[PDB]
Amino acid sequence: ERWWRFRVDYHAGPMDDLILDGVRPAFAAFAAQAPMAYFLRHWRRGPHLRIYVSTTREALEAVVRPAIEHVVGGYLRARPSPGMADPSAFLPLHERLAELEGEDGPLMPWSPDNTIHAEGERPEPLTVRDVLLADFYADTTPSVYHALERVRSGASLPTIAFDLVVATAHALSTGGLPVARTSLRSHAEAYLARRSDGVRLRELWRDHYARNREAFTERLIAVASSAESAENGAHLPHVREWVRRLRPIRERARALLESGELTDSPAFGAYRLVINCTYLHLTRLGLTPHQRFLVCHLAADAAADVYGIA
Question: Which ranges carry the Thiopeptide-type bacteriocin biosynthesis domain (predicted)?
């Protein structure tokens, strides 16, 4: 009935664990009364988690709030964050990120580390995109846990970023990977373009590609077949689920572009939005912007060597 907001401060300790061992249980403990709920990373007044959950005030006070305070709080007391040495070391960066993303709220002093805070209900009325986005975040919370599990048991996060980006490109674009590798290049290129060492960046990034050319091209075609099987049991499952989860959301978005709120609508519009959702997904899995751009770039290079010998 509303979106209710909590803040979990965890300034210096492994947010992956806090998600898996604190918030995942807590969310389960209210699954019947409030199934619609998700969380985002954020930086303001200390690195923290932002928790979003859709219920009435009655359910918040009854079931949601105390599952957070007790389950999550339990995790905090077991595995506390050691803290940040100087939060004001981060002020000039934060001042920038505020301007860049319009944040307006106070920046210093930092919230107390290792702590929970109720924050109230969202703005007042949501936009259509806000609604479609929240739906996406909630729908993909299982996929977050899947991944951080794989990461926790030794697997590589860059590689998971790869499989996902690639899959969303081949399966949800108007012409598949051979056409949407331009949008991937394009996405990395906008970052290389404003970096004074872009030149050396591109050399490093291309050395990397060359050293591993066989790994990435092999992996590229794997993810490509996985995403087009019509035979539910390929060599890779997470790809096939990721596609599966996202197909609904293009439709609801492509539908409400040619019925007309937001911005070819399907072609570069639905697929514009769900590639941007994959990017938001990956942020949530703890990939930096740097590492995401690098992944877009390696996907593109890999796609040259297979779809480009045309």
Answer: 3-302
Phi-psi region of 230 (alpha: psi -120 to 50; beta: other; left: phi over 0): left
What does 138-173 look like in DSSP terms, one character per residue? HHTHHHHHHHHHHHHTT--HHHHHHHHHHHHHHHSS
Q: How far is CA 68 from CA 2, 33, 61, 110, 285, in A?
A: 17, 14, 11, 21, 21
Question: Cβ(166)–Cβ(241) under 8 Å?
Answer: no
DSSP 24-75: HHHHHTTTTT---EEEEEE-TTSSEEEEEEEE-HHHIIIIIHHHIIIIIHHH
Method by which the coordinates were obtained: X-ray
**Dihedral class, residue 49 (left if φ above 0, else alpha if ψ from -120 to 50, else beta):** beta
Domain ranges of the chain: 2-125, 135-307
Tell me the CA distances in angstroms from 110 to 89, 166, 286, one per residue in order: 12, 38, 21
What CATH number does the domain located at 2-125 have?
Answer: 3.30.70
What is the structure's resolution, reported in angstroms to one decimal? 2.8
Strand 37-42 vs strand 2-9: parallel, antiparallel, or unpaired? unpaired
Between the alpha carbon of residue 310 and those of residues 51, 171, 301, 304, the distances in Å are 48, 20, 15, 10
